[PDB]
Design a protein around this ligand. Structure first.
Ligand SMILES: OC[C@H]1O[C@@H](O[C@@H]2[C@@H](O)[C@H](O[C@@H]3[C@@H](O)[C@H](O[C@@H]4[C@@H](O)[C@H](O[C@@H]5[C@@H](O)[C@H](O[C@@H]6[C@@H](O)[C@H](O)O[C@H](CO)[C@H]6O)O[C@H](CO)[C@H]5O)O[C@H](CO)[C@H]4O)O[C@H](CO)[C@H]3O)O[C@H](CO)[C@H]2O)[C@H](O)[C@@H](O)[C@@H]1O
Length: 467
């Protein structure tokens, strides 16, 4: 009813962003949930029954009774908190026009963000704009119409300040617009998407970090390259097993760091050996590409060298699908949970990078090649390519742009969605030579099985996907 209470409610609508990595008794880190269905990582852990839903999804054999349910609950918690704010604003007095617009812009952009999670993973899902199963195509029209309404409020700044980093901005809204327009293959909005990407490119407060290896460091958080991140902190963080929803750190580096690594060696710490980096991922980089070592941390070579320098035979404990490589971007780094005050496992400081300026450039290059209008697709592609330390210029073909995204975004939740929307999934996601993936992707796998408990509780109102 008052301004101060709506302000607190707006803050609460942001909280589900930082939940899925540990919430509702599951690990569903949203970047890995898509990346394990692509061609860059294995699943790992103790065996195929450790986080079993992950191994089933990876092999296109998810089942409604053994599914990732946490992310579903996170997304719909988000939607509910945004809906709360729209309803509260109906019953509010002495809120300025500007503050009313600002509160609406934030919670409607977040609502589309949360719906994007369930739209991409499950497609045909229930919709509510106040506290009905839509087709994927019907949810899309709701989402993109909401984003149009947020842009037209004309209230969001292009970039936030030190104090407010993590708040919705116009650039975040633009990147979210491009993500859903491109996943839908809605070419009637390609022109508008390209105009929005060019507005970010024209801004002098977004640019590439000159060193790719500086992006994923703590000092790289909210750099000139960052459009949107989900904030995680170790500073007096008290996220715990029984209190997963409190704003502290992330579980992600504990999941994907080497099992019984000797903490502090090469300033890396131990984890549970999930998402080992495939050897093929390391091999697809040129020796000149700075992304190779920023993506692929060779844990085994570090100990091989150490055991020749100081011959204590150090080892880590190899788990399932071990390769010797781990995802350096979100690896446990000595000191990145040092200031936490609860369980150190859940309180890593690593922000989750959602949108980076390199995705602005590759979005623009791709929209130009898909007929969105004139622009310098070759300049935009080659800015990303050259930042990686490659000196030879490449043409802005769709295949070169899609492969640049592949090199640029391992572990960032982009590749699986890129493979489906470009029509490459059926050709790329086939049985491997290791006997790990034994199934082939097909269009029926586009949308996961809806969790059985949701099918049951809805008593026929929710129709199961034919996965
Ligand atoms: O498949 C994935 C993977 O799973 C592994 O299993 C996981 C399993 O290890 C985990 O087990 C829990 C375990 O970590 C936990 O241990 C407690 C620890 O949490 C406790 O820490 C306390 C904090 O609780 C406390 O926090 C306080 C905070 O709650 C309060 O609100 O605020 C206070 C400040 O204001 C704050 O203090 O803070 C103190 C420090 O002051 C901490 O010490 O400490 C004890 C050690 O003393 C430790 O034993 O116990 C839990 C009991 O519930 C266990 O559940 O659980 C996961 C989820 O179920 C499992 O995934 C497997 O091992 C791997 O093989 C798999 O690969």
């Amino acid at each position: 009813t008052t301004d101060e209470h709506i302000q607190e409610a707006v803050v609460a609508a942001y909280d589900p962003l930082h939940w899925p990595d540990w919430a509702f008794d599951e690990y569903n880190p949203v970047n890995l949930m898509s990346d394990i269905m692509a061609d860059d990582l294995w699943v790992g852990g103790d065996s195929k029954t450790d986080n079993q839903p992950w191994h089933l999804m990876m092999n296109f054999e998810a089942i409604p009774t053994n599914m990732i349910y946490g992310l579903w609950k996170c997304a719909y918690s988000g939607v509910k908190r945004c809906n709360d704010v729209i309803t509260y604003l109906d019953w509010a007095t002495d809120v300025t026009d500007a503050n009313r617009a600002y509160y609406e812009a934030q919670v409607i952009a977040l609502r589309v963000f949360y719906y994007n999670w369930v739209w991409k993973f499950w497609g045909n899902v229930p919709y509510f704009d106040k506290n009905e199963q839509l087709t994927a195509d019907q949810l899309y029209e709701k989402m993109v119409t909401s984003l149009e309404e947020v842009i037209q409020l004309n209230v969001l700044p292009m970039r936030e300040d030190s104090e407010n980093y993590g708040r919705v901005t116009l650039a975040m809204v633009y990147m979210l617009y491009a993500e859903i327009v491109m996943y839908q293959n809605d070419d009637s909005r390609y022109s508008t998407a390209l105009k929005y990407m060019e507005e970010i490119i024209s801004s002098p407060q977004y640019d590439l970090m000159p060193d790719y290896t500086d992006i994923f460091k703590e000092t790289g958080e909210w750099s000139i390259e960052s459009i949107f991140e989900i904030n995680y902190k170790d500073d007096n963080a008290v996220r715990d097993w029984g209190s997963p929803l409190v704003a502290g750190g992330t579980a992600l580096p504990t999941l994907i760091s080497p099992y019984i690594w000797p903490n502090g060696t090469d300033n890396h710490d131990r984890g549970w050996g999930f998402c080992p980096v495939r050897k093929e991922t390391y091999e697809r980089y040129s020796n000149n590409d700075t992304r190779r070592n920023a993506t692929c941390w060779n844990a085994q070579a570090v100990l091989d060298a150490h055991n020749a320098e100081h011959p204590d035979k150090l080892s880590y404990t190899t788990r399932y699908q071990d390769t010797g490589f781990f995802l350096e971007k979100y690896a446990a780094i000595t000191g990145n949970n040092k200031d936490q005050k609860s369980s150190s496992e859940l309180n890593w400081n690593n922000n989750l990078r959602i949108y980076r300026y390199s995705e602005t450039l590759l979005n623009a290059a791709e929209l130009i090649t898909r007929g969105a209008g004139q622009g310098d697709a070759k300049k935009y592609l080659n800015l990303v390519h050259k930042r990686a330390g490659l000196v030879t210029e490449i043409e802005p073909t769709l295949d070169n742009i899609i492969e640049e995204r592949h090199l640029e975004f391992v572990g960032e939740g982009k590749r699986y969605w890129d493979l489906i929307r470009t029509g490459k999934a059926a050709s790329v996601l086939v049985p491997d030579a290791y006997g790990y993936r034994t199934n082939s992707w097909s269009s029926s796998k586009k949308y996961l099985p809806i969790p059985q408990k949701e099918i049951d509780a809805a008593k026929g109102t929710l129709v199961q996907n034919n996965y």
